[PDB]
Amino acid sequence: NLYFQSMDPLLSVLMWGVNHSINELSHVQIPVMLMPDDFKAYSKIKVDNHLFNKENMPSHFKFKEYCPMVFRNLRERFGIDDQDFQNSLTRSAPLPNDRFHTSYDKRYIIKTITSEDVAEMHNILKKYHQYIVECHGITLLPQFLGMYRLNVDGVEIYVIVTRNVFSHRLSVYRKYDLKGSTREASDKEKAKELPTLKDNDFINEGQKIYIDDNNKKVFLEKLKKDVEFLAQLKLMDYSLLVGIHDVERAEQEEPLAPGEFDPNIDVYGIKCHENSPRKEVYFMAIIDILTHYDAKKKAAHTVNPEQYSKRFLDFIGHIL
Ligand SMILES: CN(C)C/C=C/C(=O)Nc1ccc(C(=O)Nc2cccc(Nc3cc(-c4c[nH]c5ccccc45)ncn3)c2)cc1
Numbered sequence: 001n002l003y004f005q006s007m008d009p010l011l012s013v014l015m016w017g018v019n020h021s022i023n024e025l026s027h028v029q030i031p032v033m034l035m036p037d038d039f040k041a042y043s044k045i046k047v048d049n050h051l052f053n054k055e056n057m058p059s060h061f062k063f064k065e066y067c068p069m070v071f072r073n074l075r076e077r078f079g080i081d082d083q084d085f086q087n088s089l090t091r092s093a094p095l096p097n098d099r100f101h102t103s104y105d106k107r108y109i110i111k112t113i114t115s116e117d118v119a120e121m122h123n124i125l126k127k128y129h130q131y132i133v134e135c136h137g138i139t140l141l142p143q144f145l146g147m148y149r150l151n152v153d154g155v156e157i158y159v160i161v162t163r164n165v166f167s168h169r170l171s172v173y174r175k176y177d178l179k180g181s182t183r184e185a186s187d188k189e190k191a192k193e194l195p196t197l198k199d200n201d202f203i204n205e206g207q208k209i210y211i212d213d214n215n216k217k218v219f220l221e222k223l224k225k226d227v228e229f230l231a232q233l234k235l236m237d238y239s240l241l242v243g244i245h246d247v248e249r250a251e252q253e254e255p256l257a258p259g260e261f262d263p264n265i266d267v268y269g270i271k272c273h274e275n276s277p278r279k280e281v282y283f284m285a286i287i288d289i290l291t292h293y294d295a296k297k298k299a300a301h302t303v304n305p306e307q308y309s310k311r312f313l314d315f316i317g318h319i320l
Helices: 009-025 036-040 068-077 082-090 115-134 199-204 213-232 247-252 293-300 305-319
Strands: 042-048 060-066 100-102 108-113 144-152 155-163 174-178 196-198 239-246 269-271 280-287
Touching: 009 042, 009 060, 009 068, 009 082, 009 144, 009 155, 036 068, 036 115, 060 068, 060 115, 068 082, 068 115, 068 144, 082 108, 115 144, 115 155, 115 293, 174 199, 174 305, 196 199, 199 305, 213 269, 213 280, 213 305, 239 247
Parallel strands: 174 196
Antiparallel strands: 042 060, 060 144, 100 108, 108 155, 144 155, 174 239, 239 280, 269 280
16 A cells, blocks of 8 residues: 655655565566666656646656666675565665655665766676675675656755665764775764764774674685775775664664574664674675765766775774
8 A cells, every 4th residue: 555655756756666676577587687778778667647646646757777787786696685675765765864764664774876876886896796696785885776867846865775884773873984094073963863984083082893803814815806896997985984883772772583684684784793892783894985976076066986995994993
């Protein structure tokens, strides 16, 4: 009984479009392998309703899905069933962060991107897909799950969907955006309830990350491979997003058990080691890897990707 209602018409078009894409794909054979043409494909749909469903949906809108075979294969390699994906994005409206949304069940992130971001996604997409194949989906890179263009009421936006780095169930009381460039959160920024700390806050507030030698060695090797892939694509300015769940604070502040998570859903979680001074769960992965060339060149009004990756790896290596 979904109607795709929301106060925001763009969200309705997004919900209707994801519903439509996934149902369309159920009428398209799963190929043995992706072929080059699948990486320049799209589907466009233009809808003009007259005096029909005039309360749930805008009457005039356009929905375009980029490379739908590829994003279907990607979801599959990331362990995501299309019907579940469909349910997560349509059973109830995505929630704003208060320009990014989460699905109502907190599984996926929905971000508005620019058209140069869409062009850069297409430039790295074959290489990205091959890398996901070769690492069997085990990576700290963002998991790109679908990419769309929406048009309603004379407004056009591009959006991309990725897996949430944070738990869909375990709450996060402290997050950092770490780069190795330094980077301090504003006084305004620390006024929020859920501020995004940065490199210098991580150091100055004495933050420790209590994971055992094995988990740390496994994470750093994954990180080094992922960041070397980014350096070859000449990408930079990405961050490590670090979310900390405090078990004891989650309990005092309100069928899986205390501090436990499903590593098949919250794929970035790492438990603290048995002798940590505080019971904690960490969620860590790489975010925001696209260049944003023109957005940043009009923002102004040097470090290369090789250098960037090495500062990055050295900083993360030092704080784990
Ligand atoms: C306890 N009490 C409150 C009751 C609980 C209520 C409750 O359950 N609500 C709730 C819970 C969790 C949240 C939440 O999880 N918030 C959050 C905040 C910052 C970052 C991220 N993750 C991200 C970001 C990006 C990302 C960055 N930049 C990008 C550029 C392009 C593409 C993607 C990206 N990617 C992947 N994960 C998630 C929101 C609401």
